[PDB]
């Protein structure tokens, strides 16, 4: 048969049957007769492809193809590639390369010396010897690509390999997904805790990946201890409204800091040690205390700032330490505030008022997704999420990912069959980076609701240069965005609300309607403090 | 405040590296001034050496050990013991002086142009610290970087001008994991598969070693009852190879393999590639009609599988936790191994089996034993079945020059031990040649280290391959002309050459009872077994 | 259609490479397979060694000679060395064998794992082709890109299987350029500020050796009766030393070489970096009120020069061109450098400026002349004035263990031209035992090569530089119990050593009237005289 037709029958194998992609000429011998069983999404740049592609495979935890047109779409892409990897994502990133019949001599779209263009943003990018090893390339992209800490891996295609008649072989295999930890580090590490006088809980996103949520809930309550989220979670890792979290902890190695005194031992599971954003002098952790750290990433511990760690899936760990710790007593672990109530008569509009609106008027069930650097407290304020799977934003910091990543959220949910509307809280600076995704959005007749908070400005760096001490920076002002037009370019339900009122109308409104719309929110250009 | 090289080596301390092995360099001499007396430090005259001594000494004390090397000059030289460090898995933390930060930018003789490249892609970490102030956290980060499983080296490029410079004491001393176990569904899920088997048979490989899983090994075959072979190329003796369950080595081509794992339903390979192949050799990787299970402790490993279902698992971990799951069989007649042929004796030029022979007779209960003499392996698997853990040792990468150094490390190992068994090392004369300068080293630190050099004035396996291969008339085959006796001679040990079998026993029980040094030329047959 | 392999040599007949220096392994046995009788293969036992005697035969020739050595681990042990071929700017063809495409995918024992990242950053092109009709094409271009200015090696990893496959007989035969030229709006900028200057000072580099310039750069310099430098670290002679207007070379610190030429207002550099510095030596990279001028024909050295204005160019179009806009100058009271010196010749143990004024009494007017002995480098200078081109030949790199093989390629070189110069070898004794084992091939090929080893027990220049740079207690730098005379029996040269200035006249002859390679140990004082 045809390196296609095989190839096609081990993706069928492997369960690994979308393809999201922008088409170029090296990639036609591939799509031809693309089969009905498969699903092709198209996207029209190769940002959106790949962060599309990185909502879906989040949603689904399994990999998905992305088909990109050889160096230029890769390099369109490559952005979204590095978030892929930091969000630690199995995608399979596939572009196709010039024929092997001119490849020699580089001819236009060639993608020269393709294995190190994507380096070093994938586990793993290879193009094969020969067309005879193209499957055996497949199985080999995914098995390094689900193996744990997971991670996107790239192959380069050489367009003339898929029709090359081979014979059948069997390059089908499995592997593990999760590695366990090693049981004397738990041990010893389940000793300091029990040890310990006032342990302190600090969760990352790995809890949220390896579907920890509920172990991670039976082991602060077994300990009675306060649990943050770690700076910069990507993903909710522990119950917002529970009685034990106390906050997402702030970037600052002195300002975390400041945020866990008082504790003798600090046990952060699942999380880099730190995520670390803006520079504040400081002890990373208070003066008498200890660290201990969970991750499944051997990267993330290799170069922690402090502590004791291990190598482990969150949840294998957590379920192994449970058994070592003993039920602690209450302690009078604090409480955090209730939401706040913002001023809904000060015009222009405050984002918490628009926030505590969406809020009031959601549905218990939906996805909510966050591009929106400046409103961050004041979203974590008003949203507390206390499922899994609801809350999701990148972890890179990298604009351009959650626009079309809340289309691949939303495929997901119709693949599930769960039909959750995703909600997604988008800056206007950062609505700009992909706004091409909404048009998958709409052609693929997903469930997505964009809040868009536009204060004309790049707010989160003005809040930089205002902690930092750094004016008249220049492109920090964006007058002159019609929002409203780029929903309607792509064929999105679009308007600005300029009230409350029409706010809560649109809202509902966009619920009630499975498709894609844009809601345009004119806020305050006033910033709060970094 | 204090100096990054005052605090550099109160972490080194801390950490329990204390050993460098070197080749020193201009750009060195700042990290290596006052070398303090709680530290050793061990000249090789070759950077191959270097790292090999180091990855000896590391497999033996299974910590890190520093190798301090010159510049871009010196890591070159190093490349090739670099990948086969790599390959072992083993934790070494390679460092290399840089030029001055005052003169970098412009890159005057003998900068490292970009040192973080040049290793790769056979370092776990490459790294060149943005300013002095990292220099002591880089080095935190490579011991962690190297010691986390699966394990292996790492690179820093350290200016010659940061060493000097006071620094914030700021306590970065870390600890990390070294072992990572197996998803319990997994085990679960491979029990099922090895208890429902009629006939398993089991294959073995150097993660065993590695990881100290050598009882846990045991226990698992004796409990299935299973044959017990060891992966094709496997650098380090993963099961006692005098136990009625093991079969043998098995050999590297595909078909050949398959061939010898023929009559089982179910092929469990633990703690090795699936697999080390060499020659091509086409067939089927595993019979028709069976399946097969993978566990590596690295997910490189079974990542690039050419068959099974894996998982990645440390092999200590996974065996202990499979144990638990999988039910006593009764024996099913697995057969025994042939015990060791007898080869001719009086047959002249002398044969290697023969040469063997006399060296195990006359060898002492302990020792450890290193090999480099490609063409001569299956005669050695035959007459040395290796028992004992920690006993064997030989590259796992097949680039030559590795195990003469490796041999003076594993010595120095012995030494800081304080178990002292003579480390005799296997040598083809072609072979010897790769990294001669290492014997020095063994010589200065006085190692007891015997080479043993199979003399057939050839590449022998080279043209093993170029029958098997049909390549008739490859020029670069023959090595008249080599005075190896004299090579001993250069570099201090003691050295001869032996005629008879008489001759070589006097002469290997004479080196076993001399604590240094020793070469012993032995000529053999030119005529070679086929592959 | 014809194999890749029969394409392939037929490609190199045309391309007139048919030098092959190697080592060999499985991989690359289907490569040399019934090696055609019209070419030559050059064993060497180590990989450094052959690199660096491909580089010496390519430096003779000036075309590309091809090295084929083994996979990731033969490479590996050559990246020293290839260091060396790129900073020397050698059009060598590497190429190393890689494992079957058959298996490629799953990486099988002695895959070259992403071959083509290995020898960054020391290539100026490294590929795999992407099938086997490929391979001569991609010859071709190696040959291409080894070959344009500036120079240098490239890197080719050829899967066994490639080269026994019929392919469609195409004809991939280039030619391309190998000098670029200046921009005259340039030639003509740089003329005018030369015309203006008042006391302009020459400093010339090795771009003059290896583009033939040597005549042209004579004329220019009489030309402006400006006193000539030679670079700091100019691994070939760019001016004849004996030239009134010679002034010697340059230091190479910065303010060490800015203290050399005060007094001159343009400072005119051409064929060279600036500046090729060693050791850091605080100050300005030319005196203040001075401007420079740069002429090389790398845009990399150009790109990071420390100072100045400077254009791209092959030195020789460049003189070429310069001289066509200068006026002649009067004679200018350029000073006379200092006859070269008398040690004293009573003193014991010998002193390394006796030893080099018997050698240099004692040679034929003829030789070329090799040295890697760093801490006699100034004494050197001072004794062996080289008046003629293609004479002196030294590593642009500073890498160790370059200069001993890379002798018996410019043995090989003096062979293929026919003018039959004795090789005249200056080696430390730290420096000999880098790449020792090159001897082998020097005997065995029967080249004309004479290694005089200064033996001072010691890494001397180290300890030059523990002194400058003050500091103490490295360990490591003393080389006691080395019998380099062993050495040389070893490997099968002429070797002995001698006690006495009238024994070393006596063997020195010998050597000259005996067409082999000799082996020359002179013991020399320990003391060392400064930096
Ligand atoms: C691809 C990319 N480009 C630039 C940035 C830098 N950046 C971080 S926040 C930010 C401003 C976001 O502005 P907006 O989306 O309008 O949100 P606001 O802060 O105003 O609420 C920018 C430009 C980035 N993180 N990623
Ligand atoms: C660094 C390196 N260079 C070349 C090779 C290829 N090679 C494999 S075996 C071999 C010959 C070994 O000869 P010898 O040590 O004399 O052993 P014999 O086969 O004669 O017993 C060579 C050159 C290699 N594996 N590694
Ligand atoms: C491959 C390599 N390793 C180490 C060095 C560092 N190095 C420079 S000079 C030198 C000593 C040379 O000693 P020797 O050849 O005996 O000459 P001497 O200075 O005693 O005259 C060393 C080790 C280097 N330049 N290259
Ligand atoms: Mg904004
Ligand atoms: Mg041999
Ligand atoms: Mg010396």
């Not at 988008?426 to 909404?438: E, R």
């Amino acid at each position: 048969r045809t390196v296609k037709e095989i190839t096609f029958d081990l993706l069928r194998k492997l369960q690994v049957t979308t393809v999201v992609g922008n088409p170029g000429s090296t990639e036609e011998t591939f799509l031809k007769d693309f089969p009905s069983d498969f699903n092709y999404v198209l996207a029209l740049q190769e940002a959106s492809v790949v962060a599309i592609a990185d909502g879906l495979s989040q949603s689904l935890r399994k990999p998905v193809i992305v088909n990109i047109h050889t160096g230029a779409g890769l390099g369109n892409a490559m952005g979204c590639l590095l978030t892929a990897y930091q969000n630690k994502t199995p995608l399979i990133i596939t572009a196709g390369q010039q024929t092997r019949e001119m490849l020699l001599n580089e001819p236009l779209l060639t993608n020269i010396e393709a294995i190190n263009m994507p380096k070093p943003w994938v586990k793993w990018s290879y193009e094969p010897a020969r067309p005879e090893d193209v499957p055996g390339a497949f199985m080999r992209a995914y098995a390094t690509a689900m193996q744990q800490p997971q991670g996107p891996v790239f192959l380069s295609l050489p367009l003339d390999d898929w029709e090359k008649l081979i014979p059948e072989v069997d390059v089908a295999r499995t592997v593990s997904t999760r590695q366990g930890p090693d049981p004397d580090k738990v041990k010893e590490f389940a000793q300091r805790i029990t040890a310990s006088k006032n342990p302190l809980l600090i969760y990352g996103s790995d809890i949220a990946r390896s579907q920890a949520w509920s172990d991670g809930i039976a082991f602060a309550e077994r300990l009675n201890a306060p649990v943050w989220a770690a700076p910069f979670a990507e993903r909710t890792p522990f119950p917002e409204d529970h009685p034990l979290f106390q906050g997402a902890l702030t970037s600052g190695i002195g300002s975390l800091e400041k945020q866990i005194q008082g504790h003798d031992l600090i046990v952060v599971i699942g999380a880099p040690v730190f995520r670390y954003y803006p520079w504040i002098a400081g002890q990373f952790i208070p003066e008498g205390s200890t660290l201990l750290q969970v991750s499944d990433d051997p990267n993330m511990t290799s170069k922690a700032v402090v502590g004791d760690s291990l190598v482990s899936d969150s949840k294998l760990f957590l379920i192994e330490a449970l058994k070592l710790i003993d039920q602690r007593e209450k302690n009078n672990t604090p409480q955090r505030s209730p939401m706040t109530k913002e001023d809904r008569t000060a015009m222009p509009l405050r984002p918490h008022a628009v926030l505590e609106v969406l809020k009031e008027n959601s549905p218990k069930e939906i996805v909510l997704v966050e591009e929106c650097p400046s409103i961050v407290p004041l979203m974590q304020d008003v949203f507390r999420i206390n499922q899994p799977d609801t809350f999701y934003t990148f972890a890179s910091g990298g604009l351009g990912w959650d626009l079309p990543a809340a289309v691949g959220l939303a495929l997901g949910e119709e693949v599930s069959g769960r039909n959750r509307p995703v909600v997604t809280l988008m800056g206007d600076g950062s609505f700009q980076y992909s706004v091409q995704g909404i048009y998958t959005g709409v052609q693929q007749k997903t469930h997505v609701i964009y809040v868009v908070f536009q204060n004309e400005e790049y707010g989160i760096l003005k809040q930089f240069a205002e902690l930092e001490q750094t004016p008249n920076v220049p492109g920090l002002d964006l007058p002159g965005l019609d929002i409203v037009a780029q929903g309607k370019a792509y064929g999105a339900k679009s308007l600005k609300v300029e009230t409350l009122d029409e706010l809560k109308t649109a809202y509902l409104e966009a619920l009630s309607f499975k498709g894609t719309s844009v809601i345009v929110v004119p806020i305050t250009k006033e910033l709060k403090p970094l």
